Design an enzyme around this catalytic site. Structure first.
Site, short mmCIF file in Angstrom:
data_model
loop_
_atom_site.label_atom_id
_atom_site.label_comp_id
_atom_site.label_asym_id
_atom_site.label_seq_id
_atom_site.Cartn_x
_atom_site.Cartn_y
_atom_site.Cartn_z
N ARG A 167 -6.90 33.51 -15.43
CA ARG A 167 -6.51 32.76 -16.63
C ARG A 167 -6.91 33.53 -17.89
O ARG A 167 -6.16 33.53 -18.86
CB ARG A 167 -7.13 31.36 -16.66
CG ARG A 167 -6.71 30.48 -15.49
CD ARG A 167 -7.48 29.17 -15.42
NE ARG A 167 -8.90 29.42 -15.37
CZ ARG A 167 -9.88 28.53 -15.55
NH1 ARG A 167 -9.61 27.24 -15.74
NH2 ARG A 167 -11.16 28.95 -15.55
N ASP A 193 -12.53 31.02 -21.12
CA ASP A 193 -13.16 30.62 -22.39
C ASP A 193 -13.49 31.81 -23.28
O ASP A 193 -13.71 31.67 -24.47
CB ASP A 193 -14.43 29.75 -22.15
CG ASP A 193 -14.15 28.55 -21.29
OD1 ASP A 193 -13.16 27.83 -21.57
OD2 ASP A 193 -14.94 28.32 -20.34
N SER A 197 -14.26 15.90 -15.35
CA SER A 197 -13.07 15.19 -15.82
C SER A 197 -12.14 14.89 -14.64
O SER A 197 -11.68 13.75 -14.48
CB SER A 197 -12.37 15.96 -16.93
OG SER A 197 -12.07 17.31 -16.56
N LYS A 250 -25.00 36.61 -12.29
CA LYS A 250 -24.13 36.85 -11.13
C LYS A 250 -22.65 36.95 -11.54
O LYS A 250 -22.19 36.18 -12.37
CB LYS A 250 -24.31 35.71 -10.11
CG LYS A 250 -23.84 36.03 -8.72
CD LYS A 250 -24.31 34.98 -7.71
CE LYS A 250 -23.73 35.18 -6.31
NZ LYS A 250 -24.08 36.46 -5.62
N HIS A 265 -19.80 33.90 -13.08
CA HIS A 265 -19.31 32.90 -12.12
C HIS A 265 -20.16 32.93 -10.84
O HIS A 265 -20.68 33.96 -10.45
CB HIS A 265 -17.81 33.08 -11.84
CG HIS A 265 -17.12 31.82 -11.37
ND1 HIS A 265 -17.27 31.32 -10.09
CD2 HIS A 265 -16.34 30.92 -12.02
CE1 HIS A 265 -16.57 30.21 -9.96
NE2 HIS A 265 -16.02 29.93 -11.13
N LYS A 290 0.81 -1.23 0.00
CA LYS A 290 0.00 0.00 0.00
C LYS A 290 0.84 1.27 0.00
O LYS A 290 0.57 2.21 -0.74
CB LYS A 290 -0.94 0.01 1.21
CG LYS A 290 -2.05 -1.06 1.15
CD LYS A 290 -3.32 -0.75 1.92
CE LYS A 290 -4.01 0.37 1.14
NZ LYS A 290 -4.80 1.26 2.00
N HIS A 350 -19.60 19.83 -20.43
CA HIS A 350 -18.26 20.01 -19.85
C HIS A 350 -17.25 20.61 -20.87
O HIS A 350 -16.49 21.54 -20.53
CB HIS A 350 -17.73 18.70 -19.26
CG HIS A 350 -16.49 18.82 -18.44
ND1 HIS A 350 -16.04 20.01 -17.91
CD2 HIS A 350 -15.60 17.86 -18.00
CE1 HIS A 350 -14.92 19.79 -17.21
NE2 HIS A 350 -14.62 18.50 -17.27
#
Lengths: 437, 436
Positions: free
Chosen positions: A332, A380, A247, A373, A323, A164, A277
């Site tokens: 990002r 993206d 994912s 909001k 968001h 383990k 997704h």
């Protein structure tokens, strides 16, 4: 040699501290941290703090952080390629895994390891050639990654009997192996007529992972060096973003039954193949190009305002904005805009100008409209347009590139899952009759 | 006056379930438990946090399907044209509709399953690309994902399809996968015979299990007991709540609106994990090692002694123990009931060892005191029964489990889409964040 510690050694050095931390957390096992409501059961566990993820935590003010470091910190501190301005995904992987910023020298050696392990077994090439032309790219990618389980050191070592306490080590070896191979697999999905050539092409072992990926996509050489920087940045930015996304979570879930990293990340990719997704970047690109079609290359601030109001009054959303928690632009996103700021050909592209203008106008409009909001741009908002600018104009394949990036974070967590001895993920179900009572 | 088909029977019960959902949703704000640190670090164990309609574990009576015990299902569910055991097709009908079908309805569903079992050429080519040594569960997972080329849901979603109709192409893909997966499994079992096994026509008057047995090379009247075992096995393992990894992973990937082929492939990748899909194999190995030590003629005392020795040496008794179930698994008892009417099984010393152990191990384990609820589970008997009928490559037992375990998760995936359940998205936290 004149060698600094390799990645595996650097990981081994930080394991004991994390096992100690885990032990301390386990002493507080009984402490209450939230409530479960009916809403959480019927609503896909939304809001329910119920899993572990070490490498990334979303800060409501600063956005996603990696071991406490902002995107801006990472751009400053993480090593770069032999030429180029952007952080390397391999360096980001080092950070995610160890909690530490590697030296340039450590990254060079890791990049070489990745390049050396990038070859594929013949049966993977044969498998890819069996696919119909029309098989969805994310189905192709998922299957080929699962098929690489023939190369799994963890699967074989577990079958033979393995303690383990050592599960993490073959888990790490398989993770590096997958990482090294997945760009080549992705390129074979992109270039279905050229499997024999792309499948066996030798890579320059002194180049970085992104550069070599670009080469296999048909965009190598010094004339594509800006694209190389974009690709490095993209792959680094999208590597990890907490455990809750499908994912990341699916990789953890399948891994928790002690399926190896090839099988586990394949489940991750099958999740990324879902329209809810993996399609955000594509949606934004389409929306931007339709906006350009309507308002032209020469427009006023009012024209942009009017276009946004029309969209909203018609009941449609502005994609790439909004968001639940983050109160500023996604860092990002800002890093992509920073990349663009030093390249005049990008700044001259009207499609990019439209992304920028929208980012300066849409938030106030969306705020005033009142239905969305925290109406700030996310990553993206810009990723698709930048790929498009560099001649990657088949948006169907943007999820494939996302799949390459998103190997980074979940594999890191899978290694930590095994280092810590985390158990099988096993929530409890209930039926609707049982919630009515 | 022809009896309703499965799709029609499903459509009839959708409105009532959407009404129930609406009622539950009004109580959205009700508190039903707490989250502790233990739940975060312990893989959400015990945390009631997901929906699963068809099956609920009763701590006394074991798994129930729409309130029915295993014993109720054995009594009420239609059987094959020959044989004593309930059909997995009938179990699927029950899971999906909440209702017991007539024999007539099951016969028609079986015919549909036989007719939809063929595979496209590219799937056969794909399977022939696999190295001989590729693990069987890797093969099965991949081939099932590859069938997404045939997905009506994927195409209909791409074209534009209203939320209220998501369930219908989801249902069509689920039936298609169910019809094909036995054949895919048989191709994994028989890699030298892809062209023949991959195209062989199925008797459309026979049941799903019978036809699966035929594709495995165990058809005909000589194998009729095996047919009953296989029906029973496939029916018993179909569904067992939402929390197991294969069920949950199928729901999770499905919740992003990946189609049933992609979704159940993720399920199978989970079943491929040693902590999910290997229990039956582990028990068989343990039983054969016990036989090696104590011989073919053994007493109750010999069994008692062997169990004590094992435990005192620090080793575990596999197939025994549960966190919540306070009796023998009713799926185990159903396998023992099957065995009880067949004298050749009862005469097999390996089966006698399973039986003796079931009569002695609980008291021994209780006295030893390390094992909570030390009663037999279904894995205590399944391997040995397959082995008795000449299915003696334990590596492939997870493949048969994979065929069975399509049933329940596909049902829930259909309901997920009928109800409009959203993407599954828990929130994560780091250890430092729990420590503060």
């Amino acid at each position: 040699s004149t060698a600094e510690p390799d990645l595996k050694t650097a990981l081994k050095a930080v394991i004991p501290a994390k096992r100690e931390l885990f032990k301390q957390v386990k002493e507080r096992s009984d402490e209450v941290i939230g409530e479960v409501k009916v809403a959480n059961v019927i609503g896909g566990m939304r809001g329910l703090k119920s899993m572990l993820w070490e490498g990334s935590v979303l800060d409501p003010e600063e956005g996603i952080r990696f071991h406490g470091k902002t995107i801006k910190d990472c751009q400053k501190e993480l090593p770069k390629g032999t030429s180029g301005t952007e952080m390397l995904p391999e360096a980001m992987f080092w950070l995610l895994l160890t909690g530490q910023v590697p030296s340039t020298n450590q990254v060079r050696a890791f990049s070489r390891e990745l390049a050396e392990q990038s070859h594929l077994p013949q049966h993977i090439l044969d498998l890819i050639k069996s696919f119909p032309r029309s098989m969805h790219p994310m189905t192709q990618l998922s299957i080929a990654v699962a098929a690489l389980n023939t190369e799994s050191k963890f699967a074989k070592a577990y079958e033979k009997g393995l303690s383990k306490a050592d599960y993490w080590e073959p888990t790490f070896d398989d993770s590096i192996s997958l990482l090294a191979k997945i760009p080549r697999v992705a390129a074979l999905v992109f270039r279905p007529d050229e499997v024999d050539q792309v499948g066996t092409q030798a890579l320059d072992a002194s180049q970085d992972w992104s550069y070599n990926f670009a080469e296999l996509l048909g965009k190598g050489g010094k004339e594509n060096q800006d694209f190389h920087d974009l690709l490095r940045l993209y792959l680094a930015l999208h590597g990890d973003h907490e455990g809750g996304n499908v994912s990341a979570h699916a990789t953890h879930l399948v891994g928790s039954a002690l399926s190896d990293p090839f099988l586990s990340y394949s489940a991750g990719l099958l999740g990324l193949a879902g329209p809810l997704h993996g399609l955000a970047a594509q949606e934004v690109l389409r929306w931007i190009l339709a906006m350009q079609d309507k308002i032209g290359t020469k427009f006023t601030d009012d024209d942009v305002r009017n276009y946004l109001w029309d969209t909203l009054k018609s009941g449609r959303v502005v994609p790439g904005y909004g968001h639940g928690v983050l109160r500023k632009p996604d860092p990002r996103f800002q890093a992509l805009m920073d990349f663009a700021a030093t390249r005049p050909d990008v700044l001259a592209n009207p499609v990019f100008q439209l992304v920028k203008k929208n980012s300066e106008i849409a938030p106030a409009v969306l705020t005033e409209h009142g239905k969305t909001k925290n109406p700030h741009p996310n990553v993206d908002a810009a990723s698709g347009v930048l790929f498009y600018h560099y001649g990657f104009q088949q948006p169907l394949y943007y999820t494939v590139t996302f799949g390459v990036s998103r190997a980074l974070g979940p594999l890191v967590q899978l290694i930590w899952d095994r280092a810590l001895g985390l158990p099988i993920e096993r929530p409890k179900s209930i039926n609707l009759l049982g919630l009515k009572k």
